[PDB]
Amino acid sequence: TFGRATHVVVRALPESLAQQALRRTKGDEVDFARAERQHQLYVGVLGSKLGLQVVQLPADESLPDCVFVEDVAVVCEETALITRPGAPSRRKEADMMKEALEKLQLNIVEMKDENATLDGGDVLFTGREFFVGLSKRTNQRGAEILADTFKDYAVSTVPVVDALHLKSFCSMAGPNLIAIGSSESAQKALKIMQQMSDHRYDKLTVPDDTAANCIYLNIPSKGHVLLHRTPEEYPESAKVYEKLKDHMLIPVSNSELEKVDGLLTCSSVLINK
Numbered sequence: 331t332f333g334r335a336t337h338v339v340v341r342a343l344p345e346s347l348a349q350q351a352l353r354r355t356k357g358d359e360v361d362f363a364r365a366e367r368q369h370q371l372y373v374g375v376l377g378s379k380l381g382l383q384v385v386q387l388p389a390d391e392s393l394p395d396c397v398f399v400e401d402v403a404v405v406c407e408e409t410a411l412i413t414r415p416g417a418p419s420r421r422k423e424a425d426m427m428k429e430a431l432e433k434l435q436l437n438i439v440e441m442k443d444e445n446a447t448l449d450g451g452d453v454l455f456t457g458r459e460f461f462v463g464l465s466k467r468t469n470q471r472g473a474e475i476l477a478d479t480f481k482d483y484a485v486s487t488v489p490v491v492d493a494l495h496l497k498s499f500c501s502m503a504g505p506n507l508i509a510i511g512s513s514e515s516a517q518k519a520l521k522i523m524q525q526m527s528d529h530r531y532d533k534l535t536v537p538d539d540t541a542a543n544c545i546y547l548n549i550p551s552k553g554h555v556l557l558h559r560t561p562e563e564y565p566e567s568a569k570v571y572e573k574l575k576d577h578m579l580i581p582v583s584n585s586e587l588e589k590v591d592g593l594l595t596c597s598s599v600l601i602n603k
């Protein structure tokens with residue numbers, strides 16, 4: 331079942347994130363205490379409200395981006411790909427992720443090739459196939475290693491030109507539903523993804539590209555659940571999500587981590603055991 335999960339890996343925010351995490355925009359400073367509250371609530375939704383078993387990794391102050399666990403592993407069925415992140419300052423985040431995923435009894439494949447890089451944020455898994463963004467973080471060799479790892483799924487690539495990652499402007503919002511931004515760049519990427527597949531996806535188009543990043547889960551006794559950005563943060567995109575009477579909708583605040591380019595998917599790795 332697409333979107334089913336039983337377990338989630340998350341990682342605590344280091345104090346060094348506020349000043350030292352990588353960020354493309356040098357805008358408003360991070361309110362660290364508020365970022366911590368937003369992470370607490372996020373983890374609480376996944377564990378307490380939705381009932382997932384949470385594995386919470388400790389912060390490492392030497393790894394200011396270590397909260398962004400998505401980028402260090404891609405999990406599909408019983409297999410985990412431990413990535414070689416594109417940013418050198420993030421590579422040692424793989425160490426504790428590999429240990430956590432071993433302890434969850436997944437089959438582990440490590441991206442060792444020193445000519446390969448891949449961030450998990452560049453990977454869109456639809457349930458039927460993978461789309462991998464080629465970005466400043468993820469190269470062709472990384473995409474090839476992903477394809478080799480998940481041999482039972484088609485893997486196609488798409489250029490990421492004007493954002494950090496593919497999932498900076500898209501995500502799955504349901505079993506056949508791709509949430510997508512409205513910018514020229516997001517729409518160009520969507521059209522390439524659609525041209526590379528023989529499967530017809532539905533789309534949930536939102537006016538704020540980064541509000542297209544959402545988390546879909548299929549949870550027993552709750553059904554089709556969608557975590558999406560709040561009306562306070564993106565009022566015009568929240569109006570689109572709010573029309574989805576076919577989902578259980580959970581607004582989740584993320585203002586502070588978006589200052590360092592993290593959206594909703596970035597702070598968890600979901601696992602179905």
Ligand SMILES: NC(=O)NCCC[C@H](N)C(=O)O
Pocket residue numbers: 351352353395398400401417450451452495497590591592593594595596
């Ligand atoms: N999947 C994601 O949303 N990753 C966000 C990573 C943000 C972090 N500051 C970075 O630059 O890698």
